[PDB]
Amino acid sequence: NFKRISYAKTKTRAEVRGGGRKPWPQKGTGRARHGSIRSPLWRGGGVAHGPRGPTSYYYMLPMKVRALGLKVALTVKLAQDDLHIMDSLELPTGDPQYLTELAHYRRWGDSVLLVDLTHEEMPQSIVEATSRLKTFNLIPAVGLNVHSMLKHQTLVLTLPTVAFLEDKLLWQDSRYRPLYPFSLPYSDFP
Amino acid sequence: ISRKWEKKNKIVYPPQLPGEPRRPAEIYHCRRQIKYSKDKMWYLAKLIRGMSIDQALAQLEFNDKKGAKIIKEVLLEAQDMAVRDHNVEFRSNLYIAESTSGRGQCLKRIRYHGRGRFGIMEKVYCHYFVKLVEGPPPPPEPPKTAVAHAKEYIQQLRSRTIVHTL
């Protein structure tokens, strides 16, 4: 939701074209009283309570809550036997058929989320293998998220990714209350 | 719009077995968009319901209503197509099993009134439908006799049960 920006919008009776003059006088015509031909009652009139402008749904859970959610997702995968640790993502070949057959043989789910430490160092073989696959998605460690972890049946992590995630998530525990955004220099925060 | 009446002539029945009564022929005909009120056409339709083709034509030939001529033309066309295409042996051996008028597609016009006011005239159009069935016209339903009335009353009396009890 936080990224959502609904662009739905409707014209209110003020914004609908025309509709300035009173259609007919208050009394004498025997018809209902009206002030413009663009009120919500009329065909082609405005919308009384329609969507208004591009609306943001932005909101931020506490970063501790988000880190706890990541931890809970990891624990859920481990406890449900969907988490697999790898020494490295290097593949014998960049053929996607090899990766799919390996997953099927090892009884991985229909969807696999592979994670590597950094984008730049990811092996060319695995990069080529996953570029041509839809249910096998390869992401950097920084891109790990609860939504993708839940969407993908199995989660594959490398050992450096495991260490990186442990460090980053455990840091949220035992950290001071911020004095200013952590992007700024701190005594001990890289 | 619906045009099922025309399609009704295209249904082909399977051949009849020798030990089966001869199926009477049925011919569905209609005229669409007649400049005439369906309410006025209904009277002519009702008049000719159940009559032989010749009797209906005779009755229509001497009726002053405009719809009478249209219905006569439709009936003549129905007779012609019944003989030519529906394998009806005798022209006169046909009776009007069904005859009805339906609303057509009408047009809206303005009728000017006295004080800058107006009404909405409707240029009324009507459809006319006929089914011609081969064979002599079915005999009219005889009026209920006193014997039949008494029989029905006695049947109702005998049908009585002891209500709301064991």
Partner: peptide, 16 residues
């Protein structure tokens, strides 16, 4: 006095 209101003329001019 209230003047009469004419409806749009197109509504009563349509043809098949």
């Amino acid at each position: 006095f209230t003047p009469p209101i004419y409806q749009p003329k197109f509504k009563t001019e349509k043809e098949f």
